[PDB]
């Protein structure tokens, strides 16, 4: 059931913005670890005396890394005279965010038809405003409302190149790395209470609950009309045998925030080969792999979708596989991206639901809680 | 003239500590860019609820990257019950340092015979105390005094593995990168006034002025008894044709601080080949190279030290060459390590002064201000 109840026209995920202490070092690490190219900048060299912002791209995926300069560089400016390229930026907010949460996502940005209308309708329907609509060079409109914690939902609309005031990066600085990542599939938040978080966000967006076909969490997914903007939300389940990883997140993050970004790959085998080669030389580490019993059990579950050789490749790379009634999901998770056990990344590829591929084909891997738990108990028995 | 006036026994540079917002991302970037191996850690996985600290090593060079966790994790601790492995660490000081200065060096650490004696003698001779001597696991003593700005001189002494409470890193996480860097040669501070800075530091150390054989700075070098701990200090010269880069540093850093670290390489050609290959894939960028006229002029200046092929290799890599009356220096400078135009790195190799090599052989490259200026004017004439 998809009631198509979006209260304004939503296109696709546009970018994700990380708030950093040093944008340069985070952006360079992420570029090498994920195979993303340096594509635009806004910093002292472009006249921005307020913040340093570096944009990485891979296909349609856009990661923005922003850090504040000394406020003394811009102390004489006011908002009408600002040199910041992102008018919602505030030195105090950014330093407070980073001190509270450490490295993490500040903005989940979606492209809409009209960001001023999206903002007005959202606030009329309960959204807490964060930054009012601002028109940049008569060409782009940006507005922000609160999503959860200190994460904002950012609306961007284009009259017709990332943002005005950003410059394309020199060819020499822009090495054409590419490990196969192509777009953001979903972005997941952790909150203390799922019910009120869903009511709030669905209330101001009109996003509907996406259908899904004891492990420490309850979750639900909100989706746009064509189900290409997907926003899962998790809450902890307390009193469990093992402590909820959602609760550990909330403790180390100092509250609600973005838990993981799932990045679609056009070739998950190539992406993981390339990422795993770089894990110990500046890139990202991956969670420990399932036992061999998990891959032996894959034949019964997805033997009509993957060949034995393709299953063997999943085992080589530690890929997890899940299936719903409509399609199949290949997924794997990194270790946390920074110092705190908070945000991490998921790499995914979806098989099926061809009509274009429909959004969320194969689900989100909820079946892998039980399948991994069974295979580890079975591997103890094998031993 | 070397009066050997050290007021306590000093051995060698021991480590450099960076204060970061996210230690993981800075350490991974530096590891890949400089070819340093992950060698020790102190973090949540080792029981440290206060700070994350990651140690990189290349030869005898040790870089420590430290960032604070949420204070809530350790809110019930007091100094007698702390889980921090570096007892001088303070959440507030670290956040204040990073907000003020951005990514940069907090501590220049030297190994001494007795850190408690070094501390006591230094303070008796005018040093401003920063952290009193603390004995760690009855095995290592650490103490800190102010050096300049918010940079401290850290004394470490060992009864007889980096520090107690640090753990060696897993072989899988510890890829054996090595681009040829072997030790810290010198560490340079920028201050508003050179005279009072030299009087203060030489006053409490007994370090002597190291002999040197219009461009925006005045500088002097302080040296230990065997001239293996070398601490140059720069001040701006105002009213110049081009604005002093020392003054630009002071503005963007919010005052005095560490300007550059010079890292000795056992094979500067290999080091720069390896570093330049990685500049656009997560590593470090280098300053623009001298014009060909500079390398043509090298024959007259160092043609008795370097062959034509060795000079051609310097030209390929953009290496600068300088000479004093005792030896020859090969050097090159990176672009700033982070967002702000503040700290950068120098790679150096010294030729001559064999007796071991004596410290500071060939000087610090002061002759390269005029030689680069002449060669750029000459290259305009060639054109
Ligand atoms: C000493 N000795 C030798 C030893 C002794 C005893 C044990 C032992 C060793 O061994 C173990 C190992 C464990 N460890 C197994 C780890 C299982 C956790 C698997 C998580 N699995 C996912 O598959 C998943 C899927 C989707 C999403 C995802 O993306 C997503 C969304 O997008 C939206 C909707 C919500 C959502 O979750 C996400 N995710 O992270 O978000 C994750 C144990 C665990 C529990 C109890 C005992 C254990 C034991 N006994
Ligand atoms: C438009 N159009 C086409 C154009 C027009 C006009 C010009 C033009 C183009 O072109 C240029 C280029 C310039 N740019 C040349 C840059 C020269 C700077 C070289 C710095 N050179 C070092 O060699 C060094 C050595 C040692 C240490 C070091 O390590 C150290 C220590 O360890 C301890 C002691 C102190 C110390 O310094 C360090 N260092 O950074 O610390 C550094 C100009 C500059 C000035 C005026 C006009 C310029 C021009 N006209
Ligand atoms: Co997911
Ligand atoms: Co130098």
Short mmCIF file of C-alpha atoms in Angstrom, two decimals, chain B residues 48-356:
data_model
loop_
_atom_site.label_atom_id
_atom_site.label_comp_id
_atom_site.label_asym_id
_atom_site.label_seq_id
_atom_site.Cartn_x
_atom_site.Cartn_y
_atom_site.Cartn_z
CA UNK B 48 40.11 4.59 27.91
CA UNK B 49 36.77 6.38 28.40
CA UNK B 50 38.33 9.85 28.09
CA UNK B 51 40.23 10.20 24.82
CA UNK B 52 41.01 8.29 21.64
CA UNK B 53 44.74 8.25 20.87
CA UNK B 54 46.38 6.54 17.89
CA UNK B 55 50.13 6.26 17.39
CA UNK B 56 51.78 6.14 13.94
CA UNK B 57 55.47 5.33 13.52
CA UNK B 58 58.04 5.45 10.73
CA UNK B 59 61.51 4.50 11.90
CA UNK B 60 62.02 6.55 15.05
CA UNK B 61 59.39 9.14 14.10
CA UNK B 62 56.28 8.97 16.31
CA UNK B 63 53.05 10.88 15.55
CA UNK B 64 50.25 10.70 18.14
CA UNK B 65 46.69 11.72 17.20
CA UNK B 66 44.29 12.41 20.08
CA UNK B 67 40.63 13.47 20.25
CA UNK B 68 38.19 13.70 23.17
CA UNK B 69 35.18 11.47 23.67
CA UNK B 70 31.92 12.79 25.10
CA UNK B 71 32.67 13.91 28.69
CA UNK B 72 29.56 11.96 29.70
CA UNK B 73 31.47 8.67 29.33
CA UNK B 74 33.86 9.61 32.15
CA UNK B 75 31.70 12.04 34.16
CA UNK B 76 32.00 9.96 37.32
CA UNK B 77 35.78 9.76 37.19
CA UNK B 78 38.20 11.98 39.07
CA UNK B 79 41.91 12.33 38.40
CA UNK B 80 42.77 9.57 40.95
CA UNK B 81 40.32 7.21 39.17
CA UNK B 82 40.92 8.31 35.55
CA UNK B 83 40.95 5.89 32.63
CA UNK B 84 42.90 8.35 30.45
CA UNK B 85 46.30 7.05 29.44
CA UNK B 86 47.71 10.56 29.05
CA UNK B 87 47.06 12.19 32.45
CA UNK B 88 47.64 15.71 31.14
CA UNK B 89 44.63 15.40 28.82
CA UNK B 90 41.65 17.64 29.55
CA UNK B 91 38.39 17.66 27.55
CA UNK B 92 37.95 21.41 27.91
CA UNK B 93 41.55 22.25 27.00
CA UNK B 94 41.43 20.02 23.94
CA UNK B 95 38.13 21.37 22.64
CA UNK B 96 39.29 24.93 23.31
CA UNK B 97 42.61 24.29 21.54
CA UNK B 98 40.92 22.81 18.48
CA UNK B 99 38.23 25.48 18.28
CA UNK B 100 40.90 28.18 18.53
CA UNK B 101 43.63 26.75 16.30
CA UNK B 102 42.09 23.94 14.27
CA UNK B 103 44.12 20.79 13.66
CA UNK B 104 47.64 21.25 14.95
CA UNK B 105 50.45 20.19 17.27
CA UNK B 106 49.69 20.34 21.00
CA UNK B 107 52.88 18.70 22.29
CA UNK B 108 56.51 18.53 21.18
CA UNK B 109 57.82 15.68 23.33
CA UNK B 110 61.49 15.06 24.07
CA UNK B 111 62.98 12.11 25.93
CA UNK B 112 65.00 13.16 28.99
CA UNK B 113 66.84 11.31 31.73
CA UNK B 114 64.42 12.31 34.50
CA UNK B 115 61.19 14.10 33.63
CA UNK B 116 60.49 15.11 37.22
CA UNK B 117 63.93 16.76 37.46
CA UNK B 118 63.56 18.32 34.00
CA UNK B 119 60.20 19.76 35.07
CA UNK B 120 61.49 21.07 38.40
CA UNK B 121 64.61 22.65 36.90
CA UNK B 122 62.63 24.15 34.01
CA UNK B 123 60.08 25.76 36.32
CA UNK B 124 62.84 26.95 38.66
CA UNK B 125 64.31 28.69 35.59
CA UNK B 126 61.14 30.42 34.36
CA UNK B 127 59.10 27.74 32.56
CA UNK B 128 55.34 28.11 32.91
CA UNK B 129 54.08 24.74 34.20
CA UNK B 130 51.36 23.01 32.22
CA UNK B 131 51.08 19.51 33.70
CA UNK B 132 53.07 18.34 36.75
CA UNK B 133 55.18 15.18 36.64
CA UNK B 134 53.09 12.01 36.80
CA UNK B 135 54.53 8.50 37.08
CA UNK B 136 52.68 5.98 34.92
CA UNK B 137 52.65 2.34 36.11
CA UNK B 138 55.92 3.02 37.97
CA UNK B 139 57.59 2.92 34.57
CA UNK B 140 57.32 6.21 32.67
CA UNK B 141 57.27 9.81 33.90
CA UNK B 142 55.59 12.59 31.89
CA UNK B 143 55.55 16.35 32.57
CA UNK B 144 54.68 19.42 30.47
CA UNK B 145 55.64 23.10 30.38
CA UNK B 146 54.45 25.84 28.04
CA UNK B 147 56.56 26.29 24.91
CA UNK B 148 54.72 28.96 22.88
CA UNK B 149 51.07 29.70 22.29
CA UNK B 150 49.12 26.64 23.39
CA UNK B 151 51.97 24.27 22.44
CA UNK B 152 53.66 22.43 25.30
CA UNK B 153 57.12 20.96 25.64
CA UNK B 154 56.54 17.47 27.03
CA UNK B 155 59.24 15.66 28.97
CA UNK B 156 59.18 11.85 28.98
CA UNK B 157 61.59 9.60 30.89
CA UNK B 158 61.70 5.80 31.03
CA UNK B 159 62.95 3.66 33.90
CA UNK B 160 63.91 0.95 31.39
CA UNK B 161 55.66 0.11 25.11
CA UNK B 162 54.99 3.71 24.01
CA UNK B 163 53.17 4.58 27.22
CA UNK B 164 51.46 2.43 29.85
CA UNK B 165 47.85 1.85 28.92
CA UNK B 166 48.60 1.88 25.18
CA UNK B 167 48.23 -1.44 23.37
CA UNK B 168 50.13 -2.68 20.33
CA UNK B 169 47.91 -2.73 17.23
CA UNK B 170 46.71 -5.94 15.56
CA UNK B 171 48.90 -7.17 12.70
CA UNK B 172 45.90 -6.98 10.35
CA UNK B 173 45.33 -3.29 11.14
CA UNK B 174 49.10 -2.62 10.97
CA UNK B 175 50.00 -2.59 7.28
CA UNK B 176 53.80 -2.12 6.97
CA UNK B 177 53.83 1.11 4.98
CA UNK B 178 57.20 2.84 4.70
CA UNK B 179 58.23 5.65 2.34
CA UNK B 180 61.63 6.23 3.96
CA UNK B 181 60.92 8.71 6.75
CA UNK B 182 63.05 7.96 9.82
CA UNK B 183 62.99 10.73 12.46
CA UNK B 184 61.98 14.27 13.39
CA UNK B 185 64.78 16.65 12.43
CA UNK B 186 63.33 19.91 13.74
CA UNK B 187 60.08 21.53 14.88
CA UNK B 188 59.45 25.21 14.14
CA UNK B 189 57.26 27.72 16.01
CA UNK B 190 55.75 30.99 14.80
CA UNK B 191 55.44 33.77 17.40
CA UNK B 192 54.60 37.50 17.31
CA UNK B 193 57.94 38.50 18.92
CA UNK B 194 61.10 36.42 18.52
CA UNK B 195 63.21 38.07 21.22
CA UNK B 196 60.97 37.29 24.20
CA UNK B 197 60.21 33.79 22.89
CA UNK B 198 63.91 32.90 22.62
CA UNK B 199 64.71 34.39 26.03
CA UNK B 200 61.91 32.36 27.64
CA UNK B 201 62.73 28.98 26.08
CA UNK B 202 66.52 29.27 26.24
CA UNK B 203 66.06 30.54 29.79
CA UNK B 204 64.42 27.39 31.12
CA UNK B 205 66.18 24.78 28.92
CA UNK B 206 69.72 26.07 28.63
CA UNK B 207 69.47 25.39 24.89
CA UNK B 208 71.95 27.49 22.93
CA UNK B 209 71.60 29.45 19.72
CA UNK B 210 72.52 27.28 16.75
CA UNK B 211 74.93 28.88 14.29
CA UNK B 212 73.63 29.78 10.82
CA UNK B 213 75.75 30.51 7.74
CA UNK B 214 63.40 40.97 3.43
CA UNK B 215 61.54 37.68 2.95
CA UNK B 216 59.01 38.34 5.71
CA UNK B 217 60.59 36.71 8.75
CA UNK B 218 63.30 36.81 11.36
CA UNK B 219 64.31 33.48 12.83
CA UNK B 220 66.71 31.81 15.23
CA UNK B 221 67.33 28.21 16.25
CA UNK B 222 67.67 26.75 19.75
CA UNK B 223 69.61 23.49 20.14
CA UNK B 224 70.39 20.90 22.80
CA UNK B 225 73.95 19.96 23.82
CA UNK B 226 74.50 17.52 20.95
CA UNK B 227 72.34 19.68 18.63
CA UNK B 228 69.93 16.81 17.92
CA UNK B 229 66.93 18.58 19.45
CA UNK B 230 66.46 21.62 17.19
CA UNK B 231 63.75 24.22 17.81
CA UNK B 232 63.68 27.10 15.32
CA UNK B 233 61.40 30.06 16.03
CA UNK B 234 60.13 32.66 13.51
CA UNK B 235 58.64 36.13 13.89
CA UNK B 236 56.98 38.20 11.14
CA UNK B 237 58.60 41.18 9.43
CA UNK B 238 55.91 43.78 8.67
CA UNK B 239 55.64 46.37 5.92
CA UNK B 240 57.07 44.03 3.27
CA UNK B 241 56.30 43.90 -0.45
CA UNK B 242 54.41 40.63 0.03
CA UNK B 243 52.57 40.07 3.30
CA UNK B 244 54.55 37.95 5.75
CA UNK B 245 53.48 34.32 5.72
CA UNK B 246 54.35 34.30 9.44
CA UNK B 247 51.71 36.98 10.00
CA UNK B 248 49.17 35.08 7.89
CA UNK B 249 49.89 32.05 10.10
CA UNK B 250 49.32 34.04 13.29
CA UNK B 251 46.01 35.38 11.97
CA UNK B 252 44.59 32.03 10.86
CA UNK B 253 45.96 30.11 13.86
CA UNK B 254 44.70 32.69 16.39
CA UNK B 255 48.22 33.32 17.64
CA UNK B 256 51.53 31.57 18.14
CA UNK B 257 51.87 27.87 17.40
CA UNK B 258 53.84 25.18 15.64
CA UNK B 259 54.48 26.10 12.01
CA UNK B 260 56.19 23.04 10.55
CA UNK B 261 57.67 19.64 11.31
CA UNK B 262 60.76 18.63 9.34
CA UNK B 263 60.98 14.85 8.85
CA UNK B 264 64.32 13.28 7.94
CA UNK B 265 64.24 10.71 5.15
CA UNK B 266 66.89 8.05 4.57
CA UNK B 267 66.16 8.38 0.82
CA UNK B 268 64.41 11.63 -0.05
CA UNK B 269 64.01 10.57 -3.69
CA UNK B 270 62.03 7.48 -2.71
CA UNK B 271 60.02 9.41 -0.11
CA UNK B 272 58.92 12.08 -2.56
CA UNK B 273 58.17 9.59 -5.33
CA UNK B 274 55.90 7.72 -2.91
CA UNK B 275 54.28 10.83 -1.43
CA UNK B 276 53.67 12.53 -4.78
CA UNK B 277 52.01 9.39 -6.18
CA UNK B 278 49.45 9.71 -3.40
CA UNK B 279 48.87 13.50 -3.40
CA UNK B 280 45.57 13.27 -5.29
CA UNK B 281 44.36 10.02 -3.69
CA UNK B 282 44.24 10.99 -0.01
CA UNK B 283 47.83 12.02 0.71
CA UNK B 284 49.64 15.37 0.86
CA UNK B 285 50.14 18.06 -1.78
CA UNK B 286 53.45 19.85 -2.30
CA UNK B 287 54.28 23.49 -2.87
CA UNK B 288 54.80 24.49 -6.52
CA UNK B 289 58.18 23.47 -7.85
CA UNK B 290 61.06 25.84 -8.63
CA UNK B 291 61.50 26.84 -12.30
CA UNK B 292 64.06 25.00 -14.47
CA UNK B 293 66.48 27.90 -14.00
CA UNK B 294 66.78 26.89 -10.35
CA UNK B 295 67.99 23.44 -11.35
CA UNK B 296 70.30 24.85 -14.02
CA UNK B 297 71.80 27.02 -11.26
CA UNK B 298 72.35 23.95 -9.05
CA UNK B 299 75.41 22.86 -11.05
CA UNK B 300 77.41 25.89 -9.90
CA UNK B 301 76.24 25.57 -6.30
CA UNK B 302 76.34 21.83 -5.52
CA UNK B 303 77.86 20.25 -8.63
CA UNK B 304 80.58 18.79 -6.38
CA UNK B 305 77.97 17.05 -4.18
CA UNK B 306 75.30 15.88 -6.65
CA UNK B 307 75.77 14.37 -10.08
CA UNK B 308 73.83 15.67 -13.08
CA UNK B 309 71.53 12.65 -12.78
CA UNK B 310 70.97 13.36 -9.08
CA UNK B 311 70.24 16.99 -9.95
CA UNK B 312 67.82 15.83 -12.65
CA UNK B 313 66.06 13.69 -10.02
CA UNK B 314 65.75 16.74 -7.75
CA UNK B 315 64.15 18.61 -10.66
CA UNK B 316 61.71 15.74 -11.34
CA UNK B 317 60.53 15.84 -7.71
CA UNK B 318 60.71 19.59 -7.06
CA UNK B 319 63.38 19.23 -4.37
CA UNK B 320 65.19 22.34 -3.09
CA UNK B 321 68.91 22.23 -2.29
CA UNK B 322 70.91 24.44 0.06
CA UNK B 323 74.47 24.44 1.33
CA UNK B 324 76.38 25.96 4.23
CA UNK B 325 80.09 25.68 5.05
CA UNK B 326 79.70 22.19 6.56
CA UNK B 327 77.11 20.26 4.57
CA UNK B 328 74.27 20.13 2.07
CA UNK B 329 70.50 20.01 2.59
CA UNK B 330 67.80 18.58 0.33
CA UNK B 331 64.32 19.81 1.31
CA UNK B 332 60.75 20.19 0.11
CA UNK B 333 57.56 21.53 1.71
CA UNK B 334 53.98 20.30 1.68
CA UNK B 335 50.92 22.48 1.38
CA UNK B 336 49.11 22.97 4.72
CA UNK B 337 48.09 19.70 6.36
CA UNK B 338 44.54 20.81 7.09
CA UNK B 339 41.87 23.42 6.37
CA UNK B 340 43.80 26.43 7.65
CA UNK B 341 47.00 27.89 6.08
CA UNK B 342 48.94 27.12 9.23
CA UNK B 343 50.90 23.90 9.84
CA UNK B 344 52.78 22.10 7.05
CA UNK B 345 55.48 19.45 6.77
CA UNK B 346 59.02 19.58 5.43
CA UNK B 347 60.86 16.52 4.11
CA UNK B 348 64.64 16.73 4.38
CA UNK B 349 67.83 14.79 3.93
CA UNK B 350 71.26 16.06 4.96
CA UNK B 351 74.61 15.29 3.30
CA UNK B 352 77.95 15.65 5.08
CA UNK B 353 79.17 16.44 8.61
CA UNK B 354 80.25 12.84 9.16
CA UNK B 355 82.34 12.20 12.27
CA UNK B 356 77.17 9.53 13.02
#
